[model samples]
Target: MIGYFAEIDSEKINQLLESMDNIHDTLSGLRRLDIDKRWDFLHFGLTGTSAFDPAKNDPLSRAVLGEHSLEDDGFLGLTWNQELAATIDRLESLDRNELRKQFSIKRLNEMEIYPGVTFSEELEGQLFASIMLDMEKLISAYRRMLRQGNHALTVIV
Candidate 1:
């Protein structure tokens, strides 16, 4: 699955809260940042864990999974405007050097974490580079959204 980080304003947020039926149109209409499988790396780095546990209320997790789950309503995740800053701060704190320190095959396998494929020593630098590139894009997108006072929508489809 691919991951999407989309900019959503208050009006669309209100519509989504009212009915999930608005989600498809809302996503199609918004400006977005999408990461391929590299989202796995960015997410793990931001949350400091391989597992996706929204219950922890980890603001960084909202980057990938959103602040509140709309899964039962057939959507992925939603992070309102108020929660944006916290996630932004967390992401901004991790620079290239910091992320490099954490991106390793041993660290990933320490948790036996693999979606459908295994990670190895040979896959380290290049994979991290791709994830890092998308991360830069995501950071820029969020910054623009925050400046415009918009909420975030995370989707995996």
Candidate 2:
């Protein structure tokens, strides 16, 4: 039989949790509208093509994930609504300076809204379930590298 083991630093785990929380809090209430306005803010943050097209309804091509591409659809399938569809246009029309400030807040919100993930009030319950699953994976990975043992085992009696 063969076995393997690894060590994990608890301090590193604590740091990761703190960073994740900061990211989550800073991005609270953010949406695609913010990301759309300031593409540079999240540059390279997505898992899709970078060629952004303002004219096309979908700026992100299907190259990354084919039909399942995250950028193919809006943050929460919001592209379907005509009014919400105009969010990009409306942001573009605002004063660049004022929009810059607003963009900061929106950028944080955009962080909250992970690309490629669908969004909808009706899906809130489902979202929580999905989040829990993701957290479980994180915890599992954390435990796999951890080990427990009694101190001073060199001279077992």
Candidate 3:
């Protein structure tokens, strides 16, 4: 099954925790205030699962999931900060072809856990391309929020 994921940042995680008490309402308020029309895009709304999981292996994920482990509840919430956001921004700018190369069918075929018959070269390439684009868009939105003076991030998995 596919799951949604977002990494949001603001001044402090507690501030976001308080604000997110009413997530839908808070999103609506942000929209109404024009504080950020991209709020929805930056908050657990991206499509596909591949991008999210790939990011789990990233160094940025270590900072978000490790250094801030104290604040993570495991199931659906976590604390985020600008350092993580900046890492994501840097990762987003990586060349898509280079990113895609790492997931080539040859490599997947060698991974013992992968069922060799499940993917075609065409399908794998398409999935990689889609994931790369999604990561870029998600990171772009997160960076915009940081630039707007939001320093801390709260993530609801």
Candidate 4:
């Protein structure tokens, strides 16, 4: 599952925490205010899974902050505070065409040692298209969130 951890102010924390029972509505409210938007991306080709469990893994926030510990401030469960501009910049700088070409069927199939583990030409093409689209949308959302001063973190397991 894709998640967004917004960098919210202390005053907003109580309001957000109180709405945990209806997180979807909470997010929807943020979206209405243009503070947040849904972040969806295809992770099948690269990560081999669409869902990420924050309980077992370190979030991009930890990496972004250059902290090794998962016990950082604002890290209550899957929520954390982090600056997302650099992450957004890095992702935006990537050339989707180059990425698509790099993960092409011809290149990917060559790395296959077994039939079942290797991606077919059709699957590779689909994955490429999906990933490219997801990246574009994700970048757009991040740009908007940054511009609106909403960089809070919320991980959905």
Q: How high is each candidate's TM-score?
A: 0.79, 0.24, 0.49, 0.50
lDDT of 1 at 47: 56
Residues 1-157 of candidate 4 have per-residue lDDT tens digits of: 2244434444565665564344555455444212121222233233222222222453332322212322222222222224456657566666666656556555445543212245566787785776566556555765676676655444332
In terms of lDDT, the poorest run of 10 residues in model 2 is 148-157
How well is each residue in 86-112 modelled by candidate 1, as lDDT tens digits?
A: 777877786778778867766665655
lDDT of 4: 0.43
Q: Stretches of candidate 2 above 4 Å error?
A: 1-112, 116-118, 148-157
Give the Cα lDDT of each candidate: 0.71, 0.26, 0.39, 0.43
Worst 10 residues of 1 by lDDT: 46-55
Best-to-worst order by lDDT is 1, 4, 3, 2
Model 4 poorest 10 in a row by lDDT: 32-41
Q: What is the lDDT of residue 19 in candidate 4?
A: 46
Q: Give one digit per residue, the lDDT tens place, for model 2 in 33-136.
A: 12122221222122212323322444322211121221221221111112222332332343533422333323333445323343454654444344334323
Instruction: Check candidate 3 and list the clashing pairs.
Output: 8-153, 9-152, 9-153, 10-151, 10-152
User: What's model 4's TM-score?
Assistant: 0.50
Best by TM-score: 1
Candidate 3 C-alpha lDDT tens digits along 52-73: 2434444534322322433322
